[PDB]
């Protein structure tokens, strides 16, 4: 009736459906599309679908997906602290996880339904994007441990590569993914 | 509390007022945090100035005690009348009063400037400016502490609302809704009974 | 009632904005009054006759002491006339239905008289379907140039939007325009509150070739700026005027001037160009570049004018 | 005002006409500070950081309802000559009054 | 039944009456009478009666009444914050609005039906009381803007004169009103 | 029950204040008990025995284990006796109906057995009229010496004032005396909180030549000050006592002193002059200029006394 | 149903019963048994039994019971101030009242029906425990007035004797009570 | 459902610890699924097949699209089979009813179809009697070796414990196990909240000759310590101060370690000895200054464990 999930129809529906895609208008206001709220949304088919993912896209897919979910959870859990004080005053590791959460939101969760290429995405393309993001996070965590500035990382040329990743065609994606995984490793190797 | 439709509307209005109050208090806390983070930088500047003043005051003390006997400097300290002319006006910050220190430090308490030892004047002026810088630091610290206490008070109020006032009002609202719905269900049951009896008593009597 | 009469005697189509220039497209207003008092009846008759708006209007006026079956039949008659005019003579018809709460109460009473067991909240279980059969008669039809537009008017019983009548009406209709009691008691007419209001079909009827290239962005910026002004108005009561930033004071001034001039229209008849000019003058109070919902092109083309339409040069 | 530090710093403050007390250990300085607070003539009392790191443990024993005789910690001249840790003190202060470790 | 205004008789009456004088038990418990709930009451005759008011009471009577209603609305809006943080957390202007609102409620809206003088009030007496209250409000706001404290304003004996105005008889009211207007102007000139 | 017994024990007119100045016969008491338990019945019997009022008291006793349909007849018979005595033998009758909730229970049972179209909470729609036919039998009649005074007792089920029984009763009677559970838990007796209480005929019996010239204004000022104190208690529940001003602190002190001295009186019998001087001692706690509802004459005549001056 | 005391059976029962022993779900969840809501409960036989209590338990037993009830009332009232301001920022007398109320609850009101000794408690044992608690309270109040900090009062070993009093068998309890009285005297004599 | 499957897999008699040491008596699991979806049905079938628990199990599986009367009849059949086995073949039968909320919805539908007098929220007024006729069939009979044990899982609507279903079920059954949504948010499985959970028959089912002699005291101490930790952390929120008495921080650390190690066990099949060892390791509080809720001399026998896991 007004977005109250406690009403009888919603309660009866959520008791039998296997997934709930809690579409949210707040994300649509902020131009986040498909505007699915990753919080308050769930799917019960991950555990049963895990063998198919391991066979058909990559053996490491469930763990990579869990890593992305954990990064999103950390970004969510730092929201009150980044609300009380601005992100610039926030600690360096917290700043990095906030930034990687933003990177995920902007380049993996975001999807242009009207784009001539980004309207559709294969499982392997999503896997490649997720692996690029976790490679970036691993390298940036190591670099933060070895003392580079977060504002240096936040300007790396690999970031626009990861951003443009989701706009490449499906047949071009494998070579792009390979060369981007080369570029990210080289760039973070060059840093001190 | 009495479950009625009017009382349910009153509870819903109270819930809306509580949510608006939470938003208002969050905005107030945002303003307080901005002021606090300005004051922390200001107090950092004051503390660095105090560090430099203390450095030079101790240097002057050491040089004076090297170039003058401890008895002479002790007697000079005795000779000057104490600079007790201090007061703190009650500065008001965010509806709270804070003591704001101010020192006069009259120069009439300085005895024989040309007759004192060589480094007594330097030590005197260094310690005077060190003391007034310390008073500046104290003012910054008391203002910062008051703003931090106000932030903690606002956080207490926001937490109390969002954690125990809003959920209790929501529970009361759902309880009243359930009671009203139960009364409506009973009324529908009675209407069904009386309609059935109308039909039956018309049917057999013809 | 005053807003209904004002819309009835002010509503018009603007074929010149579409570039058609076709004043040959007729316009009619069908006014259905349900459960009104003699005071309201006299007011409506006087308003429709004094301006000459009666000549393009059909009035179905059902009084409060008239039979309730007549109240139930009144919107049917009005919509029959509206459909006939629109889809048989290509008229553009605006149908105003006051008051739908009275209609729902009449439906409730007639259902009780027929010994029907009421549904949710004591209203008939088929009230949704009846309200749908009333509302869904408006629309535009492929192949025909006429149209039926409906503005139901309903008084929420206890200012409660959870009440069955406004709830089902929201289920069936495309948005709502909510009057504000706090605006009304501050002396602002019409007391329309933009924040809870919403037109769900608005984005289809505005823009290039229809109203103007800047309409949607101006509306979005006005909404956001007014919301900011309102919440800063609440905050300034506790933290004080000077504690706010300079742009916060600008938002305060914007909200005050917005309520004073944009909402507080009075009995003026403002063309869409006049309203857009007033909106741009109000947005010029905010610093350039603070208008984030508006593209730089529209800002360059329209930003800069000052408040002269209403005060200083009415 | 008044200052509680080593006898050298107390003598230096008396040189400028300010009340001073020479103390070598925390308990002696706090004990004399209680009597100084009971006197109440001075509006501000300064206590060495190496002497009493946290004078808040003594501020509230007296002056229960009044805060006019304000007190604060200060770096003693021995370590002030070496250098005072301004940034660490600021971080510990913001943590003490807020508690979120928010810096840079 | 039970004071439930959502009852069908009250709701049916709402839809056919031009004026609605809603009583609340909160004011009756306080022995504040007539105990009309201002927020819940309304009248649909205010607009049509304005020419008669201009011809028979004063040319500026509708504006004065509208100003009083706007003050009551502002007080109602500020009570949401007063019930949240207390009346002392407000600024001087808002607290002045609160005080003027309670002055209005106590010595304009109250009316003792058993007092030999207060039982009846002509339109011109109510006009004079409204004019006095709003003159005091304008002068008090001007004094607030020049730095005078609200607690200093609340001690003026002209407030006592305003409060006792309603007990003044109809015959001698004009002299009392002129004297009190002169007192308002003099008090807020001398007291700045 | 204790309050009703105390009122029946202490109730008296004051002809000296009314100017009549004559000896008055005591009240005749008609006691109608409906569904009364053995505890309450024994308490009432023993109280009437100790006070010696049984010899002038008619008793209609329907026990809790008696059949419930007799409760329909019981108050009507009691009021028939009361009306007969008062309006044909010049008796001043005090009628106590011990529990009208049980009467309404019996009425609901009969109505539901007859499938009467009920009102709220299942009570029959004619309950207002039925209760009126009982309550409206009290009063004073022109040309008659006697009178009928009714003090019904009803227990609101969950302390709900909006329950149909107390709601209809309040709609019929001239005000009510409402007890407060919060005052009772504080140990205050009688636990009468004045704000929800009311007496509609109070204006008729008080004032100059009846009790005293300041009675009405003192009552109004007490009500206003106690309401202010209650509001300030609600405010303290948020901002804390130390954050108050001195005037709000004065109102808070007036509120709790009011509760502990004016209300809390135990079994003592206070004359109206004693109660009025206690009220003025309480009002003297407030600033003189804040007694806005009292005329300056009464303030000058009575303001100043202290509670400790009344009792050590 | 649902713990709702407004249901018809409970309400029709309360009209006739002389004692009302209200149990509480919040106390039962936290294993605070018997879980009687002492604020909501009542008894109408308390007054009529006073001569028997004076003759058979102790001449001053009703006064001890009244003092215990007053302490519970004060503790319940001060709980609101504790929740509002925080237990740290209220005076040592009110902290003593709070701790004495906690002692009363956990050592007198709490009773384990499955413990071989605690399951039954005679009237004289309850009177002895009440005397212990009130003697401790009055001595601790005198100590607080004597400048003793509440920290060392709360650390006194006598609290262990008071807490363990209820597990003492009926046979041993008369001597345990005497030694507890002497220990209470000696402890706050030793504060000097 | 996951906890139900885990209990069905892991439940065992443990007669070796019992004073009447003997070869294990026959144990069986009767599983009744009511209003279950195809996905949950597949999960349960896979769980019972993959571990061989199906051999000692009887499954009654009523699907969500099955006729509504079969949901009513399903627990009757399950308990009839359980009673037959237990009281005519000396089986120790454990009965699991997958979702009593679906059964109660079916009962409401049937009752409204018969036009009965309603109840608190539309449920029949006799729902207590029906749920009692289901639940009371569990128990142990004098002179017979078998037993019937019931674990009815039910979904509290909107987590409201005052809803008619959990309310009546609690009024009938001897205790309840309540899952915590907050513990679920923290990633703890199984998310059982020990504070609102209760086992009425526990106090006479543990001790010497049954579990270990320190069982009841250890349970009392764990409950007391966890309650102390929770009531410390709740006061921290209101006070807003991590700075607090030293002994309080020991309980906050104890509470965190308790939730992360004792409650959070995943798919581990901990024995009672293993669980008692974990509990005693968690009892890293002071032996006498803390651990004082329950007087015990088992400290000298079991205290001093250093949290070491496998």
From Swiss-Prot, chains A, E, G:
Coiled coil segments of this chain: none
Protein family (similarity comment): Belongs to the ATPase alpha/beta chains family.
Free-text function comment from the UniProt entry: Produces ATP from ADP in the presence of a proton gradient across the membrane. The V-type alpha chain is a catalytic subunit.
Protein name stated in the entry: V-type ATP synthase alpha chain
UniProt organism field: Thermus thermophilus (strain ATCC 27634 / DSM 579 / HB8)
Gene label: atpA
Residues of the full protein shown: 387 to 578 of 578
UniProtKB/Swiss-Prot annotation, chain B:
Name by which UniProt lists this protein: V-type ATP synthase subunit D
Keywords recorded for this protein, A-Z: ATP synthesis, Hydrogen ion transport, Ion transport, Transport
Record-linked Pfam families: ATP-synt_D
Function: Produces ATP from ADP in the presence of a proton gradient across the membrane.
GO terms, molecular function: ATP binding; proton-transporting ATP synthase activity, rotational mechanism; proton-transporting ATPase activity, rotational mechanism
Gene3D superfamilies, alphabetized: 1.10.287.3240
Gene Ontology terms describing biological process: proton motive force-driven plasma membrane ATP synthesis
PANTHER family: V-TYPE ATP SYNTHASE SUBUNIT D (PTHR11671)
Similarity field: Belongs to the V-ATPase D subunit family.
Keyword presence, Nucleotide-binding: no
Lineage, broadest ranks: Bacteria, Thermotogati, Deinococcota, Deinococci, Thermales
Swiss-Prot record, chain C:
Cysteines joined through disulfide linkages: none
MF (Gene Ontology): ATP binding; proton-transporting ATP synthase activity, rotational mechanism
Swiss-Prot/TrEMBL GO biological process terms: proton motive force-driven plasma membrane ATP synthesis
Keywords, alphabetical: ATP synthesis, Hydrogen ion transport, Ion transport, Transport
Chain's role: Produces ATP from ADP in the presence of a proton gradient across the membrane. The V-type beta chain is a regulatory subunit.
Protein family per UniProt: Belongs to the ATPase alpha/beta chains family.
Name recorded for this polypeptide: V-type ATP synthase beta chain
From Swiss-Prot, chain D:
Disulfide bonds: none
Listed GO biological process terms: proton motive force-driven plasma membrane ATP synthesis
Family designation: Belongs to the V-ATPase F subunit family.
Gene coding for it: atpF
Protein role: Produces ATP from ADP in the presence of a proton gradient across the membrane.
Annotated SUPFAM superfamilies: AtpF-like (SSF159468)
Keyword terms: ATP synthesis, Hydrogen ion transport, Ion transport, Transport
Residues forming coiled coils: none
InterPro entries: ATPase_V1-cplx_f_g_su, ATPase_V1-cplx_fsu_bac/arc, ATPase_V1_fsu_sf
Molecular functions per Gene Ontology: ATP binding; proton-transporting ATP synthase activity, rotational mechanism; proton-transporting ATPase activity, rotational mechanism
UniProt source species: Thermus thermophilus (strain ATCC 27634 / DSM 579 / HB8)
Entry protein name: V-type ATP synthase subunit F
Database matches in Pfam families: ATP-synt_F
């Amino acid at each position: 009736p007004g977005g109250d999930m406690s009403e009888p129809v919603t309660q009866s529906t959520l008791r039998i459906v296997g997934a709930f895609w809690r579409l949210d208008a707040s994300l649509a206001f902020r131009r986040h599309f498909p505007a699915i709220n990753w919080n308050g949304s769930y799917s019960l088919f991950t555990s049963a679908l895990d063998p198919w993912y391991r066979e058909n896209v990559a053996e490491d897919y469930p763990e990579l997906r869990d890593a992305i979910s954990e990064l999103l959870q950390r970004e969510a859990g730092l929201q009150e602290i980044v609300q009380l004080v601005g992100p610039d005053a926030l600690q360096d590791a917290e700043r990095l996880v906030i930034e990687v959460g933003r990177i995920i939101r902007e380049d993996f969760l975001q999807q242009n339904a009207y784009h001539e290429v980004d309207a559709y995405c294969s499982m392997k393309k999503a896997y490649g994007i997720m692996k690029m993001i976790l490679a970036f996070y691993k390298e940036a965590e190591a670099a933060i441990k070895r003392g580079v500035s977060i504002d240096e990382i936040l300007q790396l040329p690999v970031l626009e590569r990861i951003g443009r990743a989701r706009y490449v065609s499906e047949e071009e994606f494998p070579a792009y993914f390979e060369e981007a995984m080369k570029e990210i490793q080289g760039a973070f190797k060059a840093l001190a | 509390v009495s479950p009625t439709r009017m009382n349910l509307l009153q509870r819903r209005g109270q819930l809306r007022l509580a949510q608006k109050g939470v938003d208002l208090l969050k905005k107030k806390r945002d303003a307080l945090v901005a002021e606090f983070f300005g004051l922390v930088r200001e107090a950092m500047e004051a503390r660095k100035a105090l560090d430099q003043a203390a450095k030079e005051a101790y240097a002057a003390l050491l040089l004076a005690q090297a170039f003058d006997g401890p008895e002479v400097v002790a007697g000079a300290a005795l000779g000057v009348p104490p600079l007790e002319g201090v007061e703190a006006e009650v500065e008001n910050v965010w509806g709270s009063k804070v003591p704001r220190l101010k020192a006069t430090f009259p120069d009439g308490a300085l005895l024989s400037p040309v007759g004192t030892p060589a480094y007594t004047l330097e030590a005197s002026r260094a310690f005077r400016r060190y003391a007034e810088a310390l008073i500046r630091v104290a003012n910054t610290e008391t203002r910062l502490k008051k703003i931090g206490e106000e932030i903690k008070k606002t956080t207490r109020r926001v937490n109390a609302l969002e954690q125990v006032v809003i959920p209790g009002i929501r529970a009361q609202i759902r309880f009243i809704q359930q009671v009203l719905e139960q009364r409506e269900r009973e009324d529908t049951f009675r209407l069904k009974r009386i309609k059935g009896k109308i039909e039956a008593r018309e049917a057999e009597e013809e | 009632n005053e807003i209904a009469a004002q819309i009835a005697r002010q509503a018009t189509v603007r074929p010149d904005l579409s570039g058609e220039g076709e004043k040959e497209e007729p316009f009619a207003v069908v006014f259905a009054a349900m459960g009104i008092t003699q005071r309201e009846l006299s007011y409506f008759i006087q308003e429709f006759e004094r301006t000459g708006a009666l000549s393009r209007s059909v009035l179905f006026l059902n009084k409060a002491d008239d039979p309730t079956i007549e109240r139930i039949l009144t919107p049917r008659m009005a919509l029959t006339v509206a459909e006939y005019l629109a889809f048989e003579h290509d008229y553009h018809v605006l149908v105003i239905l006051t008051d739908m709460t009275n209609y729902c109460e009449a439906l409730r009473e007639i259902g009780a008289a027929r010994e029907e067991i009421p549904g949710r909240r004591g209203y008939p279980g088929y009230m949704y379907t009846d309200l749908a059969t009333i509302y869904e008669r408006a629309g535009v039809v492929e192949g025909k140039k006429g149209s039926v537009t409906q503005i139901p008017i309903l008084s929420m019983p206890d200012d409660d939007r959870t009440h069955p009548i406004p709830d089902l009406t929201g289920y069936i209709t495309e948005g709502q325009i909510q009057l504000s009691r706090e605006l009304h008691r501050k002396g602002i007419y019409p007391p329309i509150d933009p924040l809870p209001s919403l037109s769900r079909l608005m984005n289809n009827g505005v823009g290039k070739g229809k109203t103007r290239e800047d309409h949607k962005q101006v509306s979005d910026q006005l909404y956001s700026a007014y919301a900011n002004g309102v919440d800063i108005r609440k905050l300034v009561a506790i933290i004080g005027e000077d504690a706010l930033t300079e742009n916060d004071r600008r938002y305060l001034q914007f909200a005050d001037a917005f309520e004073r001039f944009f909402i507080n229209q009075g009995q003026q008849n403002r063309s869409i160009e006049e309203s857009l000019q007033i909106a741009w003058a109000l947005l010029s109070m905010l610093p350039q570049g603070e208008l984030k919902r508006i593209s730089k092109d529209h800002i360059g083309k329209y930003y800069g004018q000052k408040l002269e339409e209403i005060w200083g040069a009415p | 005002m008044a200052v509680i530090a080593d006898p050298e710093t107390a003598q230096g403050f008396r040189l400028a006409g300010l009340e001073g007390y020479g103390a070598s250990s925390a308990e002696e300085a706090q004990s004399l500070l209680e009597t100084l607070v009971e006197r109440g003539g001075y509006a501000l009392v300064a206590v060495d950081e190496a002497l009493l790191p946290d004078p808040e443990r003594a501020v509230e024993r007296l002056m229960r309802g009044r805060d006019l005789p304000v007190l604060l910690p200060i770096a003693g001249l021995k370590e002030a000559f070496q250098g005072h840790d301004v940034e660490g003190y600021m971080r510990e202060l913001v943590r003490k009054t807020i508690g979120f470790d928010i810096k840079l």
